[PDB]
Amino acid sequence: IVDRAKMEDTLKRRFFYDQAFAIYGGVSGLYDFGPVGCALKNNIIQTWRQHFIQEEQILEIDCTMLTPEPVLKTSGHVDKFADFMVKDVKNGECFRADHLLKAHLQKLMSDKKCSVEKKSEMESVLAQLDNYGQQELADLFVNYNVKSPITGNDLSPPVSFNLMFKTFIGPGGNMPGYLRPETAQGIFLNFKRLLEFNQGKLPFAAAQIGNSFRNEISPRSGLIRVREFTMAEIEHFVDPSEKDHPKFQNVADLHLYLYSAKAQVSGQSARKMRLGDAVEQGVINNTVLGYFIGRIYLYLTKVGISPDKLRFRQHMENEMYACDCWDAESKTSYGWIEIVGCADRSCYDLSCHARATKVPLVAEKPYVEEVVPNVIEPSFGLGRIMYTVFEHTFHVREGDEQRTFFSFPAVVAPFKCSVLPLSQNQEFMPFVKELLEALTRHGVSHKVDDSSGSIGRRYARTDEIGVAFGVTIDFDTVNKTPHTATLRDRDSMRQIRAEISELPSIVQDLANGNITWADVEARYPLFE
Amino acid sequence: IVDRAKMEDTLKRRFFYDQAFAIYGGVSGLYDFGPVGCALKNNIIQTWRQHFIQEEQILEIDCTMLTPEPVLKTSGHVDKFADFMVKDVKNGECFRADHLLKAHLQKLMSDKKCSVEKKSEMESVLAQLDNYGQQELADLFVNYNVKSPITGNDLSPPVSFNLMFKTFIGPGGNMPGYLRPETAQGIFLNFKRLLEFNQGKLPFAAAQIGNSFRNEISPRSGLIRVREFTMAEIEHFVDPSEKDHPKFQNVADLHLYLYSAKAQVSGQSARKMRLGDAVEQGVINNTVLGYFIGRIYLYLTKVGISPDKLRFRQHMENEMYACDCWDAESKTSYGWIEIVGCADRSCYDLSCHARATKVPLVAEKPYVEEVVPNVIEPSFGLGRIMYTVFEHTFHVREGDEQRTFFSFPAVVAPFKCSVLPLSQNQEFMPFVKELLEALTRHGVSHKVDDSSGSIGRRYARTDEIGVAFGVTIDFDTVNKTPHTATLRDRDSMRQIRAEISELPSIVQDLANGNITWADVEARYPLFE
């Protein structure tokens, strides 16, 4: 129930992110990220690296965004990576067909002149939107007499509009290509090299952190629907026989909201289950998929997503070379949105590329068995994760001035510690310099505050961009022995007074969750 | 004089980088980076961040790669970002015109039947290749009777081929666009936001680390000529009146090879000058440009480039809204190549975008003067920097087996320390675990070696990918009190024996240049 307008104002004003090409009129679906935005984005990525790449010793690779057409024919993107599009017969404006129909039916279903059996007829139509093919969607548009929501004109019949950006590699026009819509295909194309790199042994995982592109018809959902975006994708290859994850018991005790395909079909709510129980009961198929669900859960929660607004939804059969797929979804002002996909596949692109190229993309276990690995595919939409953190950590202070802050965890806060000295004279610099060097030595990021106004107004700006902690250096710090300084907690605004030399280690422990603010207060004198 | 074939074999074999889409036949100009490649690439970027962004408190931003056409019309890329291209009249193959002519003239100039005055006529033609426009280049092709080097057929007249990848943003075809050829324009488009972010004050600098694209006609120079590549670009805005850099004296004492526009015109060699002297004598225009030259020098040299194969070349007037431009160039097997550009500009894109959009992109100094900033533009071609490091750090061991290694500095080595235990049993794990945790605590990256063969063969693999140090844990380490382990220096292969607990701090100091290998040897017992 966040105030999106107010949050959006702060995000725009402090330049977390803003519309690309604003001065040229902007382009929808495209956003530039400013200094604090990049800081946060970079912390999210760094946290991801430690949590997955380093923790599982994943094989990292960096493939190109430019992709020649045949690669993407084989993966079936050329033929199937499209949204049905309908356009106005007169002026020619384009509309995403599925959404336009859904709006039209919801409109009619709200009418009082509309009958009960008619509404239940349209409710069932909504329950199949994604299944309908071209013809039957074309018929739905005629039957319900759908028009342009802007002008009211007749609409053209639905047509498949491929979502990949097209270009040409090299001169002439003989190598058509695309900007990649995902990074998984690069990992597949490199399967041999990666398997060799792993001494031919299985299991192993590979990852990419990079940009992919999706030429959306009409993005109007802020950061949620963009045409260019950074992904972090993992492809975990596993022998279908040895499909049990050794580290599963590290996450078996986690309690998280699971939303089964059955629960959705039967129409009951999501269940908070013990990860271990879910696997024993058959709800999660296996412990490899299970392990990653829990690891995804820990990552999202570590980076600022609220557990009470986080759930894992299994795909229905109708969504569909099928898969057992679970999406991490967060509760936002746009509703529940997927922020991390996690698919379990047996037959997939690796086999298509194999016969497409006549190059065997298989594993060999000695006795010499051909092993076509299964994959668990954790796919992280970094932009959406960040946007969710914004909505889940944005708060408004209790005051007339309506000051705001983000309760960003210390590991993602643009920086962990603001250092505000009351003066910058020669008497103060030895203390600031020392504090900065100590914070660096303790791996605590920081920035000297040189803004205007009272200490409280200065910290208010700091709070507005979500900086975790603050150290005030005043005249008593510089002039009284021993030299002590105020440590201020962002969330509570409560303050403490410790020796300037002790604070670096105190902030570090707070930032790393070794110590609570309460702990600090129990050990150090309170200060106002 | 590096053995490129041998280096290329190692680079390919250990999967630093390799041809993209190999299994589909490959695409020239495109390369995937494997695990060690990504490690090195990521270290280069991290080192860059500390050296520039953190050191100068640069304003970081992340703009989109997709760019709508008008943006790039204004910057003049649409009309002027092209190479003259000539194609075969029969089969239709394309050739970069400038290179084809240069090959043809060099061919004739090598002929013994060719006269002296004719050769000097062609030498002068080469001295103007870049200046020649379409018509006069077309005439040069007729006059010298240039044909296809493959078939020998007649060539079409030179035509301007724009190097930007074209696409369409959104549906229909009303928003044509391009993949950005550089990141500077994003910083210009965000000038207002960045200036505001900096409290309206000047100077300030902004940076992007990201990919840009250049649709090269025929790339055949490995990593040097690619169609997709990561850049790190800085745009340092400065008041033309206050064009003196406060920190200049930090780099004034550096001695580096400078290659003036005069030296090139007069035809004399590059000069090793003191940075300070160069500025006093007029060779470098000012200390802002000067400061960054020295900072570029320190960065390149820190990351592995050899000073004796590094020079800064000033642009000639003919290269040309002009500029005082200096390129960092490295000596490679492909000759001298630019790896970092550094342009000083007074009139540039900021003013074009201003009148294009009717949005004032100026600074205001109170008295209220309109300030149109100058810019120093350090532009880093990360791929080329990395390739140069490969050529400058690749060595071949003195042996029959022709073992190779990269002498990568510790800050860029894929990881700093290989840990090889002789066993992985329950008696050895407490020591390995402790060593790994200690190395982590000391910020020293590492990887347990689990490969086959003798200790020396194991380390040889480690050396081949340039890992800086090595710690052998053997039975004496686990069974004898006190518990000591071998520390091995990559370059020399010399070994030392210190207590397992002392080594973390010893490796850290080596890696951070606080201590020499010689120092270690003076303090600890030598071991073979």
Curated annotation (Swiss-Prot), chains A, B:
Outcome recorded upon mutating D83N: In CMT2D and HMND5; shows a large reduction in aminoacylation activity
Effect listed in the UniProt record for changing E8G: In CMT2D; phenotype overlapping with HMND5; complements the defect of the wild-type gene in yeast; contrary to the wild-type protein, strongly binds to NRP1 and competes with VEGFA for NRP1-binding; displays slightly elevated aminoacylation activity over wild-type
Record's keyword annotation contains Aminoacyl-tRNA synthetase: yes
Substitution effect: I217F: In CMT2D; uncertain significance; shows a large reduction in aminoacylation activity; demonstrates a change in subcellular location pattern; does not associate with granules
Key words of the record: Acetylation, Aminoacyl-tRNA synthetase, ATP-binding, Cell projection, Charcot-Marie-Tooth disease, Cytoplasm, Disease variant, Hydrolase, Ligase, Mitochondrion, Neurodegeneration, Neuropathy, Nucleotide-binding, Phosphoprotein, Protein biosynthesis, Secreted, Transferase, Transit peptide
Annotated residues for binding of ATP: R214, N215, E216, R225, V226, E338, I339, R384
Subcellular location: Cytoplasm; Cell projection, Axon; Secreted; Secreted, Extracellular exosome
Outcome, altering G453A: In CMT2D; shows a large reduction in aminoacylation activity; demonstrates a change in subcellular location pattern; does not associate with granules
Documented effect of changing R295C: Found in a patient with mild left ventricular posterior wall hypertrophy, exercise intolerance and lactic acidosis; uncertain significance
Effect of G177R: In CMT2D; shows a large reduction in aminoacylation activity; does not impair transcription or translation or protein stability; contrary to the wild-type protein, strongly interacts with NRP1
Transmembrane segments: none
Result for mutant: L66P: In HMND5; does not complement the defect of the wild-type gene in yeast; contrary to the wild-type protein, strongly interacts with NRP1
Effect of S148Y: In CMT2D; uncertain significance
Enzymatic reactions: tRNA(Gly) + glycine + ATP = glycyl-tRNA(Gly) + AMP + diphosphate; 2 ATP + H(+) = P(1),P(4)-bis(5'-adenosyl) tetraphosphate + diphosphate
Effect of R403A: Decrease in catalytic activity by more than 10-fold
One GO cellular component, as annotated: extracellular exosome
Positions of modified residues (Phosphotyrosine): Y334
Outcome when changing I217N: In SMAJI; loss of function; based on yeast complementation assay
Activity regulation, short description: Ap4A synthesis is inhibited by tRNA, via the disruption of the second ATP-binding site by direct blocking and/or by tRNA-induced conformational change.
Transit peptide listed as a keyword: yes
A GO molecular function held by the record: identical protein binding
Description of how the protein assembles with itself and partners: Homodimer.
Function as written in the Swiss-Prot or TrEMBL entry: Catalyzes the ATP-dependent ligation of glycine to the 3'-end of its cognate tRNA, via the formation of an aminoacyl-adenylate intermediate (Gly-AMP). Also produces diadenosine tetraphosphate (Ap4A), a universal pleiotropic signaling molecule needed for cell regulation pathways, by direct condensation of 2 ATPs. Thereby, may play a special role in Ap4A homeostasis.
Name of the protein described by the UniProt record: Glycine--tRNA ligase
Full-sequence portion shown in this chain: 118 to 727 of 739
